[PDB]
Amino acid sequence: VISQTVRVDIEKLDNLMDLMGELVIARSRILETLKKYNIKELDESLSHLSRITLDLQNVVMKIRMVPISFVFNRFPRMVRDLAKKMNKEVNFIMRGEDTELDRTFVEEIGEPLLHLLRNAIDHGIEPKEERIAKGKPPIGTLILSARHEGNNVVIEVEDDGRGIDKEKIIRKAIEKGLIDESKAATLSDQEILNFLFVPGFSTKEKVSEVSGRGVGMDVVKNVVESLNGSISIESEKDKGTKVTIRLPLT
Amino acid sequence: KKVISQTVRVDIEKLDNLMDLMGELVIARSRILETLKKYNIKELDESLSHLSRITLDLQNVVMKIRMVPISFVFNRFPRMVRDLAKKMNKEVNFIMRGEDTELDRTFVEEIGEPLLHLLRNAIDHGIEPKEERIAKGKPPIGTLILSARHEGNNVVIEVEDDGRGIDKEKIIRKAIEKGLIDESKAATLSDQEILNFLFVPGFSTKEKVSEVSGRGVGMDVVKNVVESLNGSISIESEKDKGTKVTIRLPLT
Ligand SMILES: Nc1ncnc2c1ncn2[C@@H]1O[C@H](COP(=O)(O)OP(=O)(O)CP(=O)(O)O)[C@@H](O)[C@H]1O
Numbered sequence: 001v002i003s004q005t006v007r008v009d010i011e012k013l014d015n016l017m018d019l020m021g022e023l024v025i026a027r028s029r030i031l032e033t034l035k036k037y038n039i040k041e042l043d044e045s046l047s048h049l050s051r052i053t054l055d056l057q058n059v060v061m062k063i064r065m066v067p068i069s070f071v072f073n074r075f076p077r078m079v080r081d082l083a084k085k086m087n088k089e090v091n092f093i094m095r096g097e098d099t100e101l102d103r104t105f106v107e108e109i110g111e112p113l114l115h116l117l118r119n120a121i122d123h124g125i126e127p128k129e130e131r132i133a134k135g136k137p138p139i140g141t142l143i144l145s146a147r148h149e150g151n152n153v154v155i156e157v158e159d160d161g162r163g164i165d166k167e168k169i170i171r172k173a174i175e176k177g178l179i180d181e182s183k184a185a186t187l188s189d190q191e192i193l194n195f196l197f198v199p200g201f202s203t204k205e206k207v208s209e210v211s212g213r214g215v216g217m218d219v220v221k222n223v224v225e226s227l228n229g230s231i232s233i234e235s236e237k238d239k240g241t242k243v244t245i246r247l248p249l250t
Numbered sequence: 251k252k253v254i255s256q257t258v259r260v261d262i263e264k265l266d267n268l269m270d271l272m273g274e275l276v277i278a279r280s281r282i283l284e285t286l287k288k289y290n291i292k293e294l295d296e297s298l299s300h301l302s303r304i305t306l307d308l309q310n311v312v313m314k315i316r317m318v319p320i321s322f323v324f325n326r327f328p329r330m331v332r333d334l335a336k337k338m339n340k341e342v343n344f345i346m347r348g349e350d351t352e353l354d355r356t357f358v359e360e361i362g363e364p365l366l367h368l369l370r371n372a373i374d375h376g377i378e379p380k381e382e383r384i385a386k387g388k389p390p391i392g393t394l395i396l397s398a399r400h401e402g403n404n405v406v407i408e409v410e411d412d413g414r415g416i417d418k419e420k421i422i423r424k425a426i427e428k429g430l431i432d433e434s435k436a437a438t439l440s441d442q443e444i445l446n447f448l449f450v451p452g453f454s455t456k457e458k459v460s461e462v463s464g465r466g467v468g469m470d471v472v473k474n475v476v477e478s479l480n481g482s483i484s485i486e487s488e489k490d491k492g493t494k495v496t497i498r499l500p501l502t
């Protein structure tokens with residue numbers, strides 16, 4: 001009878017990934033050197049080596065896999081704290097905590113999600129008294145969801161709050177040389193909302209920028225795109241807002 | 251700034267797949283050089299040297315992670331002992347030392363039953379009943395000691411009891427009956443040579459040898475398991491002192 005599986009520490013995985021990278025580099029310089037030769041079974045000897053390195057890396061990536069709980073678990077308290085600090089009442093729900101990602105993806109996607117969450121609590125959800133007056137459920141609900149679907153990983157943040165004012169976006173868009181009135185009426189809903197990812201889409205204020213990349217919504221897309229992922233927004237007045245983030249799953 | 255997470259853990263099911271692939275990786279290197287012999291191309295060797303450097307460096311730390319302390323088998327022993335000790339009605343004072351000494355995981359589950367066997371031995375044939383024990387002027391309390399430690403590049407596992415010891419003469423005379431040796435040859439035998447008869451496949455038993463199995467319970471298969479890990483096993487037994495079995499396993 002047997003007792004199972006084993007704990008390691010980062011430094012080893014760190015040391016492992018370093019050599020993995022060096023292995024990739026070395027394999028590439030070999031293929032470049034012998035690229036001039038056209039020998040038949042030399043190709044198969046090289047292709048075999050590549051196949052090994054790939055399958056070797058492919059296993060490493062399966063070790064890299066990590067539950068998104070590492071980040072999600074930090075949230076319910078922060079959402080709780082943010083809610084009362086901003087004088088709001090929110091019912092916060094997490095779904096798909098078990099969904100597993102590459103370790104790199106998880107320790108990147110953390111801050112952008114926290115941002116989107118704060119956005120929902122701050123600008124999204126109306127004060128309780130306003131919700132009751134409009135016929136909406138007294139307490140706003142906030143859903144952070146992560147699912148394995150297709151060959152991608154889909155993370156969604158959804159709220160039933162105010163929603164986003166598209167006209168305010170369009171007017172600001174024209175306010176500083178982006179479009180005019182004519183090419184404004186030709187815009188789909190999503191590409192209107194896509195203005196929010198423009199660097200410093202300004203109703204806010206200038207920022208002096210140190211040590212980082214940026215401050216707000218333009219950074220979310222930046223992080224997502226650094227992971228070769230995708231992002232867009234759905235919203236309409238007095239119904240709610242949903243941000244969808246898709247990440248390539250390997 | 252980034253966001254912090256924690257430390258991880260993983261299974262061995264694909265951890266052995268690393269070694270398997272990396273063991274298959276060094277093969278892929280040589281196969282290239284060998285196909286570089288047929289057509290004679292030598293200017294690459296600087297790049298193929300790093301591959302050996304990397305694979306080795308890779309091979310080391312890939313296996314350097316799978317070292318786990320020995321308490322993941324040792325801690326299931328003490329009540330696997332006390333229950334069969336009373337099963338044979340004998341008292342055993344079980345003591346484990348060096349439980350925090352570590353070795354490869356793929357070893358510890360294949361070293362498990364052999365260790366259990368040596369323990370089962372020491373209880374049964376090793377430790378004599380208390381009446382016989384107090385009649386032998388020995389302390390009435392039977393003390394069985396399981397031990398593990400670092401020594402050089404090897405891990406030393408020791409199962410030591412204080413029992414009747416092993417009758418070396420019974421071994422010699424049994425060996426003479428089987429025609430392995432005779433009195434002339436037996437007179438020159440060292441204690442190691444004598445005890446090594448216990449590792450002879452059809453020696454220490456009266457029953458199972460010819461057409462029964464390839465798999466049997468005995469000290470013969472215990473040795474095979476040890477050197478299936480490319481290790482070494484040794485026995486030391488003084489008479490009425492006790493029996494001390496030693497297993498040494500490699501590292502790198
Ligand atoms: N869930 C949501 N519902 C309503 N409006 C939202 C929203 N998410 C963002 N917005 C709007 O988009 C504009 C910009 O968001 P951005 O993320 O760049 O701002 P911010 O960095 O100022 C967040 P904070 O309040 O956390 O400082 C907001 O100022 C708000 O008017």
Ligand SMILES: Nc1ncnc2c1ncn2[C@@H]1O[C@H](COP(=O)(O)OP(=O)(O)O)[C@@H](O)[C@H]1O
Binds near residue numbers: 367375413454455
């Ligand atoms: N710790 C020990 N003390 C005394 N005798 C032992 C010890 N271990 C093994 N022996 C002797 O070695 C013989 C072979 O044991 P083994 O090969 O394990 O199978 P079995 O225990 O079924 O005989 C036993 O008959 C026993 O007399």
